Amino acid sequence: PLESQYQVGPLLGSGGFGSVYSGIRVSDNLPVAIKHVEKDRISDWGELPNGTRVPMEVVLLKKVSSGFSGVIRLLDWFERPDSFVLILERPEPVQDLFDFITERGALQEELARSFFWQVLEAVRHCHNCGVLHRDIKDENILIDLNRGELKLIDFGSGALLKDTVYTDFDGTRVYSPPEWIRYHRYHGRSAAVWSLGILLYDMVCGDIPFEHDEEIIRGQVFFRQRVSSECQHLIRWCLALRPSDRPTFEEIQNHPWMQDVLLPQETAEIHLH
Numbered sequence: 488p489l490e491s492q493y494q495v496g497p498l499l500g501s502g503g504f505g506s507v508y509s510g511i512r513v514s515d516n517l518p519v520a521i522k523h524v525e526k527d528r529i530s531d532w533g534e535l536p537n538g539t540r541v542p543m544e545v546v547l548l549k550k551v552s553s554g555f556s557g558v559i560r561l562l563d564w565f566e567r568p569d570s571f572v573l574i575l576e577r578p579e580p581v582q583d584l585f586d587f588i589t590e591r592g593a594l595q596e597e598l599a600r601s602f603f604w605q606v607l608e609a610v611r612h613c614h615n616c617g618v619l620h621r622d623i624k625d626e627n628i629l630i631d632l633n634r635g636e637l638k639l640i641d642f643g644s645g646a647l648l649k650d651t652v653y654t655d656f657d658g659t660r661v662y663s664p665p666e667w668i669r670y671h672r673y674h675g676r677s678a679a680v681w682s683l684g685i686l687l688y689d690m691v692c693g694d695i696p697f698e699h700d701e702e703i704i705r706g707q708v709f710f711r712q713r714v715s716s717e718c719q720h721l722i723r724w725c726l727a728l729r730p731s732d733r734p735t736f737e738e739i740q741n742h743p744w745m746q747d748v749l750l751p752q753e754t755a756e757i758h759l760h
């Protein structure tokens with residue numbers, strides 16, 4: 488029933504996470520994304536309520552796909568003999584944040600503020616649902632160009648959120664916190680906050696701040712672009728070397744740089760139309 492119910496289109500991307508294609512649901516023409524993951528490259532499995540053996544990515548997406556949020560929702564999935572196939576929402580028109588920043592350079596603060604806010608809301612939603620993403624970064628964020636709405640996408644390195652230490656990590660190194668680099672240990676929330684400080688820097692400078700391990704551990708941030716004294720302050724706070732000196736989500740969202748955010752729609756009117 489998979490190749491009857493969806494019409495496949497062009498490849499949208501491929502890499503660590505598999506191959507993803509543009510698609511349409513025949514039933515009604517909903518734009519969808521069709522993501523293929525090979526069984527052999529799943530290191531990490533879980534089980535659903537009714538109790539079958541699936542990729543953790545499917546468990547996590549089901550836990551966050553309830554109601555509306557800034558997470559791309561899992562509409563359906565399928566098992567094949569050597570792969571799983573996931574059917575996801577697909578906004579239209581869309582551009583991932585990596586390509587957006589690649590095309591336009593450093594974002595104006597007003598736009599970064601709007602985008603960063605929506606990321607924080609999506610991450611809180613995930614954490615609320617008991618899910619840790621663990622690979623928050625520009626290429627895992629989609630922008631709906633018409634509504635100005637951001638959507639988080641690739642849960643393949645994620646895990647159930649817990650309050651004890653994690654000793655495995657599979658996201659992107661250059662977004663990984665110094666405690667991971669040095670001790671191979673981190674807690675979920677505070678590692679997520681570090682990745683958010685890398686993301687924010689990336690947004691307002693048009694590039695990531697750290698490339699090598701020794702830079703991460705040293706944790707000294709330099710601005711190549713004219714940035715406010717406040718935005719800088721928030722970024723250096725998220726990027727505190729000690730996990731316990733990092734802000735909580737609440738404290739990020741109450742920081743002075745985060746006041747007077749634009750709503751998504753006005754964001755797209757001003758910056759994306």
Ligand SMILES: Nc1ccc(NCCNCCO)c2c1C(=O)c1c(O)ccc(O)c1C2=O
Nearest residue numbers: 499500507520575577578581582583586640
């Ligand atoms: N890797 C990608 C690379 C590009 C991409 N959109 C391409 C649209 N043209 C702008 C270039 O970023 C997507 C993806 C996805 O992984 C992607 C996804 O994983 C789920 C739903 C989606 O809409 C998408 C998705 O729209």
